[PDB]
A paper describes a structure:
Aminoacyl-[name] synthetases catalyze aminoacylation of tRNAs with their cognate amino acids in two stages. First, the amino acid is activated by ATP to yield the AMP-activated amino acid, with loss of pyrophosphate, followed by transfer of the amino acid onto the [name]. Malaria parasite genomes encode two different lysyl-[name] synthetases (KRSs) that play a role in translation in either the cytoplasm (PfKRS1) or in the apicoplast (PfKRS2), while Cryptosporidium parasites and humans encode one copy. We present a selective inhibitor of both Plasmodium and Cryptosporidium [name] capable of clearing parasites from mouse models of malaria and cryptosporidiosis infection.
There is a high level of sequence identity within the active-site region of PfKRS1 and CpKRS (96% identity) and an overall sequence identity of 47.7% and similarity of 64.6% across the entire protein. Furthermore, structurally, the active sites are very similar. For both PfKRS and CpKRS enzymes, a marked shift (>2 °C) was observed when l-lysine was present, suggesting an analogous codependent binding mode.
Numbering used by the authors:
A (entry chain B), B (entry chain A): 45 to 545
Amino acid sequence: SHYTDNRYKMMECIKDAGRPFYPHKFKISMSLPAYALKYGNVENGYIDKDTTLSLSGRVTSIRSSSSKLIFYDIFCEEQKVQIIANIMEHDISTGEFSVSHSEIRRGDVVGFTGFPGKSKRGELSLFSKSVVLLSPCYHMLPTAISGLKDQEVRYRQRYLDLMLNEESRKVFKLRSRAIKYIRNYFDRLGFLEVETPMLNMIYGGAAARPFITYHNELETQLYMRIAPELYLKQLIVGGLDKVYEIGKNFRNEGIDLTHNPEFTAMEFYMAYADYYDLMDLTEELISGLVLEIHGSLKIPYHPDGPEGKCIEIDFTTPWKRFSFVEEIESGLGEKLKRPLDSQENIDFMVEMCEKHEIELPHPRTAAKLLDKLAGHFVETKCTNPSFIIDHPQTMSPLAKWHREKPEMTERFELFVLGKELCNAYTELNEPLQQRKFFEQQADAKASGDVEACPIDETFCLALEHGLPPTGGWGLGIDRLIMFLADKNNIKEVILFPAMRN
Amino acid sequence: SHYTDNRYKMMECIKDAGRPFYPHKFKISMSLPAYALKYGNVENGYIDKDTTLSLSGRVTSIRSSSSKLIFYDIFCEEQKVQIIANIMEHDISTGEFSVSHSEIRRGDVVGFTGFPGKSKRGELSLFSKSVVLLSPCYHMLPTAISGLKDQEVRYRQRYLDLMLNEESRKVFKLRSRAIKYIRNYFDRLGFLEVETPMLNMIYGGAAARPFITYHNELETQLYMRIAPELYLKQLIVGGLDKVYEIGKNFRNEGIDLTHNPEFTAMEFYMAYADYYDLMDLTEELISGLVLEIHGSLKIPYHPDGPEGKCIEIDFTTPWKRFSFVEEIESGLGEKLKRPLDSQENIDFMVEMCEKHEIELPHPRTAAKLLDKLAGHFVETKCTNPSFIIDHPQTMSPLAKWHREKPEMTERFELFVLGKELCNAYTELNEPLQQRKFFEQQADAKASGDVEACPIDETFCLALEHGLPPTGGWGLGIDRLIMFLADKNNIKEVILFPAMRN
Ligand SMILES: N[C@@H](CCCC[NH3+])C(=O)O
Ligand SMILES: N[C@@H](CCCC[NH3+])C(=O)O
């Protein structure tokens, strides 16, 4: 803290002496990338004293070869430029040379004015006549993220990570590029991007515990959305035909290294599509995105970090399909009992979970037990992108009954390395069944399933106005970034992730 | 209503009789717009019996001239097509003609197969051979939104508005087009789009009361954001140079025709800009968007609805500037007392609010009093887009002190027709002052100012790492759409606005 208090003392001295104190505006002549572009191929030793330029960035290096010569590195917009400050060139009307430069520290934001060219040793340089302190750094910075107190500083103080660590800047640029690619894919198909409410008197459309809030003037409990699905289907009733939404969902659950209370999701709804159409689209969209980002469909992934084992993920299309129940039964060496939601089958699934050392869910609903079995026996087969298809109705209250398989729905999930990326189905559009599945959901919630949702009467009424046959789909954008950028925890792909206090 | 009950009984009859019941997949040959493009110019009476096509849409009309000849209109993706169903073309493998058509009602989503062409009277038609009920409508629909019970039905059941009313569909395509324009403008300048948290252990960056929630596992209270500003500025400390975010902010306040609990806002931050640069950018961005949508810079506005008076809004640049204090003082006929936040000026502004019958704020802070006076004397002058500039520091805790004007800041608001559209300033980047102004905001909060924010220690520490000279800017997208679309309430430009009950 001595360095910080000393810096406040310096700045007070600068202000009281009438020297530059946080200048409002510094007019650069060009960006540092442009400067490297215009001068990065001059002859060694070239200097143009007929051109005075102004540059600015953050100081990353200060070296004094002598009391008369000082070398700076400044960094801005991914470009480093060296500043050579020779006392012979200094503008005395800005102060004596030693005074001007004694106010500068590594980490400061500074401006320089001078002549362009390259040093005799060949370094792109500005031969400076002056230096302005634009915004001082009051703390001693490390030279790299290795010198941070610990690597959680990167998440709690993300500006330090971005300032010092090119890899972190790269991730969030890639994140923006990937989302651009996705919007363009759907815009070219004639989709309409929409926004639906994040605050509602009800929640639904996913299996998640919601955040609860309160509107004081309405005196009403509200929920933050867990998914936009039910609103988006109303827009298809309304005739908009192809809609998508990219935004935050909120889940009130565990904050570990791979779960964040808010996450970025996309959904789209396409009238007259079924889940087979959506499989084809998923493959085209995601393989095209991987090809765009990586230049091939085979990309590395390091589950235990960059010095650990590497798995090469192959996105070559088409992808493997695993049928939900059949693959469980192949793993068990026994068939599930029918109906899948009978007490007989619930008891059987409990027994199978205990036999295979699968953690039991609470409460022990057929749907939650089926999910545990799928997690053990099927998700574990999904190394390369793989579709798990035809989920039981009992775990898929909004998915339409399978046109051929009793008790199943026209649903798929996309898994990569055993992690869920997409969830999609032929949409249930028959209001009697929809109401019945909502009632079974509400019973699960009353029995202690914090992930079951209440009945939504406004959605049932919308279905009574005629939802066309429709296919809908969701994508977890954060998990997708994790694979594309090869990061093994979600805190790497979210600028300001939640952290335990 | 007997209609809904009867329709449910019809569908149960259909299901039990093995007749088509919510088909999973209907494969259209082409969209109705594509159909009109291909066949819209054939001769009257043309029919191509060598081509069989499948079309689908929602039934908007059923008419007939005998038991043998039925006429439908179907509507889909903004295009109407007439279907001519002659018993002599009926495919009996789908049932008897009279039975197949007895199942169809106005409002149903239906499919047809048949031959393309035009009736002798010149109507684009499909000469059908079959009809499929895809998703029935269980309610009797009006033919236009005028037949709705009330016009709050348009907002509470938006699918009915979208289904019946072309003007509502136009609004939301316009909204998408405008947001697309804004992204492209900033993408071309090299900006990076980012996402920052909507859930925080603190709130800040705007004047608004927040929604409060709770994270159960972390056992900690959270706030929904009122603005992303404090996170976005950390990204500039981090070196990202040019960032923007387009997302929801949340305000826990009154719900009415112009106030929604959530609204769509944009912010951007640009290193090395000042508020003068931001005024020029606002003019360029907004006038170019107006030009893109309207074809000129002079656009109509109907503050009392479409048959009422029409105002012309003139976006020709440069726009009028009003200086905050000077214009208040011109309206008063006398000067405010200095310092503006002295008890003397607080007493004086209370007296002025009383004399001019201005509703007093609570509490009676200098900032809220200054805001009441500016709303009365200055915002009312802002018909055409106009900048109110140089706000007092006492109401601008995050804006940098004005380089020429004591007590003022380098801030502007953009007003159109007396309503705020933008808020922007040269960013305060001096940490001592920033802490002082945060404490002042905390004191307002403790005195009952539900719109003042608590001190953010994480942000103060971020400024201690050096925020470059920076300009930041926010835009209320909903208000913008209201003007661009000539709508006089916010419920018209939000798909699912919050409503009473
Ligand atoms: N709402 C789903 C995504 C879309 C499912 C198909 N309608 C989810 O959160 O997983
Ligand atoms: N946070 C401001 C917009 C940005 C102002 C300039 N930093 C608002 O909500 O009005």
